[PDB]
Amino acid sequence: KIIMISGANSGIGHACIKYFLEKSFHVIALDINNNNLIDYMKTDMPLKVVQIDLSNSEAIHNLFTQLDLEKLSPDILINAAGIREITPVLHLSDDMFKKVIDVNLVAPFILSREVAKRWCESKIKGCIVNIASVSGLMAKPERAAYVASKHALIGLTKQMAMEFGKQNIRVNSISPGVIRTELTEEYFSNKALMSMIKSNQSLDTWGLPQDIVSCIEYLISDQARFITGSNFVIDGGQTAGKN
Amino acid sequence: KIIMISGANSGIGHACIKYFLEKSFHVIALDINNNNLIDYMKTDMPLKVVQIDLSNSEAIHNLFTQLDLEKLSPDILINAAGIREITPVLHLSDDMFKKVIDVNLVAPFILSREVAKRWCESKIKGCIVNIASVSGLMAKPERAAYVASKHALIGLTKQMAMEFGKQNIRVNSISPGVIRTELTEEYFSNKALMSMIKSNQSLDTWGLPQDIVSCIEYLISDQARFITGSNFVIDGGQTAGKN
Amino acid sequence: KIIMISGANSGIGHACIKYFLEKSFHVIALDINNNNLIDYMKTDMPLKVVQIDLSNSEAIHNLFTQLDLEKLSPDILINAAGIREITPVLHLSDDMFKKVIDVNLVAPFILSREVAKRWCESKIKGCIVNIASVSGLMAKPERAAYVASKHALIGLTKQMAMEFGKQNIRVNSISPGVIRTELTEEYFSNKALMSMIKSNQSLDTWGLPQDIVSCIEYLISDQARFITGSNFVIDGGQTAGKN
Amino acid sequence: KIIMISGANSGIGHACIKYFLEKSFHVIALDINNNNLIDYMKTDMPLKVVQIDLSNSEAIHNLFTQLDLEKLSPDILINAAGIREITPVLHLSDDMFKKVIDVNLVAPFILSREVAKRWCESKIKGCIVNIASVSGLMAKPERAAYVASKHALIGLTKQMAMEFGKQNIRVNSISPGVIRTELTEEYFSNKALMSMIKSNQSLDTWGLPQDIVSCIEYLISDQARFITGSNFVIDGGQTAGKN
Ligand SMILES: NC(=O)c1ccc[n+]([C@@H]2O[C@H](COP(=O)([O-])OP(=O)(O)OC[C@H]3O[C@@H](n4cnc5c(N)ncnc54)[C@H](O)[C@@H]3O)[C@@H](O)[C@H]2O)c1
Ligand SMILES: NC(=O)c1ccc[n+]([C@@H]2O[C@H](COP(=O)([O-])OP(=O)(O)OC[C@H]3O[C@@H](n4cnc5c(N)ncnc54)[C@H](O)[C@@H]3O)[C@@H](O)[C@H]2O)c1
Ligand SMILES: NC(=O)c1ccc[n+]([C@@H]2O[C@H](COP(=O)([O-])OP(=O)(O)OC[C@H]3O[C@@H](n4cnc5c(N)ncnc54)[C@H](O)[C@@H]3O)[C@@H](O)[C@H]2O)c1
Ligand SMILES: NC(=O)c1ccc[n+]([C@@H]2O[C@H](COP(=O)([O-])OP(=O)(O)OC[C@H]3O[C@@H](n4cnc5c(N)ncnc54)[C@H](O)[C@@H]3O)[C@@H](O)[C@H]2O)c1
């Protein structure tokens, strides 16, 4: 199987590249940066790395030209590339709101549409997993674009699941709570902050990239044949309520 | 009180212009069309009509430069301008997805940020109502951008309610079900379709613009003092469940 | 019009009694206590006070046999009677859990079923408003029964809305955030508790019974003709998210 | 490891018995009937079978007395026993509404409290899985008690997850869509009703008990360390929206 994973240079998407490579998949890795993939690019692993700014829809079109010319058509798409602003909403510029939208929502849409197109043409049973967030279900401060983008992606998941259901293409999302990655690593040296995170959820611990990889493994498995349009929350109780 | 209302040339937004002018508000009306607003312009009702493509963030910026020069700032913002594609997702182009997002989400974001900036600097207690949709809570076919945009707008509402809560700026959404307007008018002479719409909800009728205007009236009233971050569904039971 | 209001001796249901008497409704008041309703009974306002334990389903059955004999069938039902435990779940007894369920869920169910039976017989357009809670959408500590009961009542509201929609019987719920009543009075003299409440929501205030009464007023109005199966959150932003 | 599974005689619960015995768990099976479990007791697999009417709370307390004497505390609890009425709500009796509540909500609650009590006393981790339903998230006709009870169980899951999270007791729910079991078997020979079922979801198939077992298997695994308070929908797209 061929799996295409965005966000491959860091955090959850990188954990996925490593995991799926170890399980003998052919991996197409998409990211705007590649410093964490250079070593692997020098090996003979079945890894194709594309350096791509997924905020640029022209660039995504060029990616599918390249993939089609290389006869590479993934079976599975993991939309994990994403960005998060931390900024007072009055200081969030038009261009920055748009940028978050373009990465977190538009790119998943376009990548999903293109893979679905090729699956419908070839009559293949594809699978998409969208990395949303608990911010797709509730708000947080200083994250207007982020929260909007993640709400959007939950909706998109359900919509595309309905759209391609008769073609046996399954589309699901995962909504992580706090996962220790490069995105969130700054939190973990701050005592006050770690205390407040632990206060906002039920388990006295934090997630790791492997917790989300495991979920992905489940959602792409044969055991997930009846799962489509669902959102799986992996958040140590962050969304359960208020305490 | 000054009320800024997008989508003012048609449908819900147009019913709003009429009703609120009738109630002695000063109205700033935004829309890309103005043919229905011309008659009202001929009167000396306190109505400013702006012809503006809200998909162009530069035209929104010019709008607000004009308003600042005129020392005109709204007390209330109704985000009602919206578009809806009906397009099988494999035929939904990058530009069209992004256009729906830019009208349905980015314009409410920018209008909201700009009014809220002026409220925070003046220490005025503002109110924003976003017209989302039941497509902000569930999916529908051939509506990938629409569903994504309406889900986004619901999360944006929650986020901005949170962001501006300490400044006493309330931000709520309304999720209509089927409302007879120029958007949906084509359905109403199709018997097959009308019967399907009625089977998909609880009440044997459809909504009218006035159903949404009355909800807006409540949400901007003093009786809505403790209401923020809420989504008011006005849908004849369309979202209640199945069968 | 006759309006039947449970919880009539205290808090929200008492504020309803007074308000709706003032607008010329005939009121049927249901509560297990009556000390606050005594003054009202002495006047000859059109108020019928019934002292009833709504956790006793046979007493409810008798009430309706009586009401039938007296030709008092309500046109509107407001289910406001409720209780709330604050008990660590390991100390929450079988009986305490069942009682909270019986009062918060079963009583609304039976009352609703009986009023709707009479509307369907008479071909009347009835209206039910269930007072749920934000604890019907998320969890809180030491409130296992309360949370379960309120999630149930949200479900029940949707279900009855669908069941009775073709008969033009509308069924909606209100989910209050923190409303200052006898239920919550103990909180208001604890400063630390009040601070935590306020930082868990958007608005620096709390709700009053009148906030809920005005929402009731809207939902029973003719302007609510297309509203059924909806849950109206009146909560100062408490549910918007975290921070 | 010991797992207690309710509803062990039929459908999902029975599929669990067989599966987890094959995996070397010691299984405490609970059900009001036992005819499908007789054969298993004939082998000497580590299976305790208990005949118990889980609507009877004293019978639950006697169960725990007897397990305490045998020193068998389960490590994992799967609440799968349930019932569903198909009855027009005007014909749904007080007792039948309460019965559905007692089986579908109150028994999960008591079982959960009792296992949690012993996990907290022994300072052992514990894991609960509650079998809710898509009727826990939306309504369906003729199912007032069932929709109520399943909404309640979703809320109870979230609450208990919050309540016991500091003790590392994880509590999650699974919400199946149409699973072919003895509960639903009657539908499958009805051509028209099958066609309506497929029309209401995205995938042209139905679930099997194994689909829910596999979800349980994931929720009780070490890969589920960060999952609590979550609701996993396994429904073929039934909840995605309306088509
Ligand atoms: N870590 C968390 O706590 C958390 C919580 C919930 C959801 N998420 C989501 O998980 C996903 C992955 O997060 P992460 O923690 O691994 O973050 P990360 O920053 O460690 O990795 C994200 C990767 O995405 C890539 N990316 C960003 N913008 C891109 C662009 N324009 N083009 C191509 N690649 C781009 C980044 O360069 C980076 O390598 C994101 O969508 C994030 O919003 C994370
Ligand atoms: N009518 C329904 O059944 C229904 C259901 C749910 C939600 N809604 C929403 O309600 C809102 C109003 O819908 P309506 O039914 O009144 O539709 P409408 O088409 O009658 O009115 C929409 C107006 O918005 C304006 N508009 C669109 N694009 C714009 C642009 N780029 N710049 C400026 N103005 C623009 C249009 O010119 C038009 O006058 C929309 O957001 C719509 O999605 C409608
Ligand atoms: N006040 C809040 O902050 C808040 C928040 C959310 C929801 N609610 C809900 O609003 C509703 C009204 O609450 P309130 O604040 O007015 O509480 P309150 O305690 O002041 O009034 C509730 C009334 O219901 C009656 N009641 C209780 N059990 C009864 C029984 N067995 N039979 C008859 N009457 C019975 C009580 O006697 C009392 O008069 C409740 O369902 C409650 O859960 C309140
Ligand atoms: N099958 C579906 O399509 C579906 C969909 C959503 C949720 N569910 C839920 O999944 C769970 C399992 O359902 P299933 O399809 O296996 O049903 P089933 O009828 O096949 O099995 C239910 C079992 O629960 C037991 N039970 C019922 N009442 C009991 C009592 N008072 N005490 C002890 N045992 C009792 C029954 O005897 C039976 O063995 C239920 O909670 C059901 O509501 C099923």
Numbering used by the authors:
A (entry chain A), B (entry chain B), C (entry chain C), D (entry chain D): 5 to 247
The paper states:
HILDH belongs to the short-chain dehydrogenase/reductase (SDR) superfamily. HILDH reduces the racemic AMKP to (2S,3R,4S)-4-HIL and the other seven stereoisomers of 4-HIL in an NADH-dependent manner, suggesting that HILDH has nearly no stereoselectivity with AMKP. HILDH forms a tetrameric structure, and each subunit consists of seven α-helices, seven β-strands and three 310-helices.
